[PDB]
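Why predict the complex rather than its parts? Because the way molecules touch one another can change local conformation, and only a joint prediction can capture that. The input here totals 191 residues.
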Amino acid sequence: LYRLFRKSNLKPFERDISTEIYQAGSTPCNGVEGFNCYFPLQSYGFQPT
Amino acid sequence: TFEYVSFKNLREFVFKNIDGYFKIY
Amino acid sequence: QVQLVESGGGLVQAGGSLRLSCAVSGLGAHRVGWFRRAPGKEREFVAAIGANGGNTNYLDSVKGRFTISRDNAKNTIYLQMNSLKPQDTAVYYCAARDIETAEYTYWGQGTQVTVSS
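Output of the joint prediction:
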């Protein structure tokens, strides 16, 4: 995995294991994803091709 | 994720989060 | 491009368990999500699962009796309803993300599932 969004640029040598959604917009997300409610993590793809 | 081993007396301590490390005196 | 098709939507009696399973073409690079349209409301989040992932998010209302799964073999995702409370009837849509900017990249045609009390 890796991350696409975070509150701010992490400091050097810090571990972030947070899960809360990142509010790109002023819209409240209330713990549930939606439009402008971006889940931070994203998986990769590792095919032999 | 860790474990370690160590009014007449007063304990004085300084804690600092520097460089992503925690230092104690 | 990748395409998703929804099947398995139909009326169920109160308390029934119907497993909503939508097929996906070229799954693996994407995370898929389940949203439903209330009769007078817009889509809201219910379930989503990342490939081979244990990352699970659910709405508090649908919490406690829903789970989502990804088979990894037939390229189809499975959502199970367990004892639906009648007001929870809605149309569920499969959607996927490549790089989410506004919402999920693709929207499925969806299906209708309804419950009779």
